[PDB]
């Protein structure tokens, strides 16, 4: 039931009311993922072209 940190200005105001107290991967690794995915694509397409060549 206590109000704290009441701040006022021309635009408005703010405060806090308490009703009760308590009871990353590097750029290297990212490139290694993107290029590893691209290689799997290149491999899959290479197989298709090989199959179509047969």
């Amino acid at each position: 039931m206590e109000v704290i940190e009441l701040n006022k200005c021309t635009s408005g105001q703010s405060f806090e009311v308490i009703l009760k107290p308590p009871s990353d991967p590097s750029l290297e690794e990212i490139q290694k993922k993107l290029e590893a995915a691209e290689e799997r694509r290149k491999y899959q397409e290479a197989e298709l072209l090989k199959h179509l060549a047969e």
């Binding site: 200005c9 635009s11 408005g12 105001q13 703010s14 009703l19 990353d24 995915a37 691209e38």
Partner: protein, 439 residues
Amino acid sequence: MRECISIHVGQAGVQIGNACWELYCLEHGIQPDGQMPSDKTIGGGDDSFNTFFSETGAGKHVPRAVFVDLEPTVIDEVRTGTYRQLFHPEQLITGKEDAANNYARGHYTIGKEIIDLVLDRIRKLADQCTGLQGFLVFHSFGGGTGSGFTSLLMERLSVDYGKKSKLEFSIYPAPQVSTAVVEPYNSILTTHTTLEHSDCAFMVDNEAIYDICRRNLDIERPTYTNLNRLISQIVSSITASLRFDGALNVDLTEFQTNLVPYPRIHFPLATYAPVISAEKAYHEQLSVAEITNACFEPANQMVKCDPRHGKYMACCLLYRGDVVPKDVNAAIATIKTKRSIQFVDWCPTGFKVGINYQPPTVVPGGDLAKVQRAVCMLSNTTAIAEAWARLDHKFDLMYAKRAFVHWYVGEGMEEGEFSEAREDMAALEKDYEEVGVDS
């Protein structure tokens, strides 16, 4: 004054971004030309609004924003739109063909060819900043670009800006307006990859927005334009503290501090009131008590869930208009003894309150009526995990049959990433349950 850069990814991001920056211009009295008459200091300054707008010598106020889409069709409308003079061409980035609702296509295949371009375009905005706070990133979960490219961008941002904060505005998929059966896949994949890179994410379920438009705006079949103007109001309520003079949530870091006790559980629930139809002949203006009480009604939430069967970790009340602290405190007193509001034991049962005397600005000709007072409640409740549960269940149904999976594997993604992402979501649900559930 510390700068904020907004990044809009994919169709949902761009179109929502359009609505927001349109609303920002009205709120700050900025013209479509970029001119702002009330700005006495020409060609610079460090006012609160300067956090979102930079200035030129000719007195033009341009948004600190970048738009990115793998397809040109949507951003082309921005290039030719009413706010074409607002952005300089560098800020608007587009590709030739999109991610085709495929996370892997947007993340790996196509994403690899434009990521360096986007980052360089972002670096140019950063160089214009004297003290960058971080980024606000708008995107859908369901799109291939919104999901796949965004997660790639967030990973790169953490690398190039390891100290800056990053907030999300994410669109959760809804069948009533969805355009792909694989949106559950795309949602889980992007959430897994972005999770450690996002400091605070505000999810918006299209289902909730759709029904609000139908129920309260009397719109029979809501369009994206209908959805986005409503979404922009919520986004405006949330970013208002960064753009105006105040003492609550003054910088991006405050959002994490006030709303996010645990890093992974960084998904605050947004509730907004009142939503009134402009077509209604006259209207009884709702009091502080009535709009505050409506913040605990599931029908007004940006995500449909039941906060009664969860726990609160934090609660922020953002008022716009005719509101004084006295009436707010009295409204809370009535509500606390009326509704079921439980906080976690290691948290104080309290509310952080911010008031902005300026009433909500509405788009002239829109569907929202002008009100003398509105409020947006930001509450970090475990109840929002219901949305994770729903999403994960739809994932499991399809993935058990490996339906559509070949579309992702074909783009270079390994099948193992599916189960890895899913197990991450599985742990996420468990975290929510640990915090909000007992016997």
